[PDB]
Amino acid sequence: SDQQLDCALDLMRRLPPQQIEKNLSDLIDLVPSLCEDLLSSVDQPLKIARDKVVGKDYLLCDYNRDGDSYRSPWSNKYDPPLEDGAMPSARLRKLEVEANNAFDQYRDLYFEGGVSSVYLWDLDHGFAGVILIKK
Amino acid sequence: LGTRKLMHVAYEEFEKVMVACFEVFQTWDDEYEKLQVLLRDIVKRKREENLKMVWRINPAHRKLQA
Numbered sequence: 001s002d003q004q005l006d007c008a009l010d011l012m013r014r015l016p017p018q019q020i021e022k023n024l025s026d027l028i029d030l031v032p033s034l035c036e037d038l039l040s041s042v043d044q045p046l047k048i049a050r051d052k053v054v055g056k057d058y059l060l061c062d063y064n065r066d067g068d069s070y071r072s073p074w075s076n077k078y079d080p081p082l083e084d085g086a087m088p089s090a091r092l093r094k095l096e097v098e099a100n101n102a103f104d105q106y107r108d109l110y111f112e113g114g115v116s117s118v119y120l121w122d123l124d125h126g127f128a129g130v131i132l133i134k135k
Numbered sequence: 136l137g138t139r140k141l142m143h144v145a146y147e148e149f150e151k152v153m154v155a156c157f158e159v160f161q162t163w164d165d166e167y168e169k170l171q172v173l174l175r176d177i178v179k180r181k182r183e184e185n186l187k188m189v190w191r192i193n194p195a196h197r198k199l200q201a
Contacts, residue, residue, distance in 0.1 A: 087182045122185070 005034060012042050020044045046134045048115060051075050059117040059132035073100050073117055088120055092127060096120045103131060111135040160200060 008027060015023055021044050028035040040062075047060035054074040064070045066085035069078035073096055078085045088096060099118040107116040114135035121128055141149060171190070 089182075089184050091184070124185075 001031070001034065004031070005037065008034070008038065009041065012038075046132055048134065049079065051077075052079075053077070057115045057117075059115060059134055061119075061130060061132060063119045063121065063130040064117070071119065073097065073119060089122065092120045092122070095127075096129070099129065103133070107133055107135075160196065163196065 008031075011027065012020075012024065020042075024038070024042055024044055028038060049058050049060050049070055049072065051058055051072040051074045054072070056072075056074040058064070058070070058072045058074060060070050064073075066078055067082050069080045069082040069085055071078055071085065071088070076087065076093060087093075096118060099120065100116070103116050103118050107114050111133070114133065116134075117132040119130050119132075139152065141152065144152075
């Protein structure tokens with residue numbers, strides 16, 4: 001079913017970018033055994049979460065998808081309440097909070113509003129992060 | 136070992152002292168492995184990094200044990 005996957009990606013390639021989420025769910029509803037195989041290279045919009053304790057916003061992707069929860073960078077907590085997630089390095093947590101700060105400045109300068117988020121993770125000789133911006 | 140006068144006793148008393156020495160050494164080894172596992176789960180519950188932590192410990196008692 002590998003050719004089926006190639007044609008599926010081409011179908012998303014030619015799919016109308018107005019109903020990306022719904023049609024992606026439909027395509028997954030065809031062959032659900034190939035579901036979380038497509039949710040790695042099929043670009044779709046973001047999901048806005050809500051940090052309850054801080055009163056901010058934070059976007060959702062796979063990098064913050066810790067287990068099945070989301071690490072709110074404004075609070076470093078997981079939502080759904082998973083107290084078993086993969087916390088980042090405390091070093092990287094400080095680097096991440098300043099990252100979120102700098103990109104809030106970035107977002108405010110170009111977008112004049114909108115929501116942003118910057119998550120982080122390791123590397124043997126470095127680190128790696130993701131930057132979400134949704135205006 | 137200084138207050139033992141170990142170089143003159145018989146093998147009965149020296150054997151008992153020998154076994155007691157290995158008793159202490161085994162308390163060190165198994166309880167130290169329990170402390171090892173203790174610190175292992177401590178580093179797991181803290182979730183900080185992947186440092187090159189040296190556990191190749193050559194303490195001050197193996198020097199006499201050999």
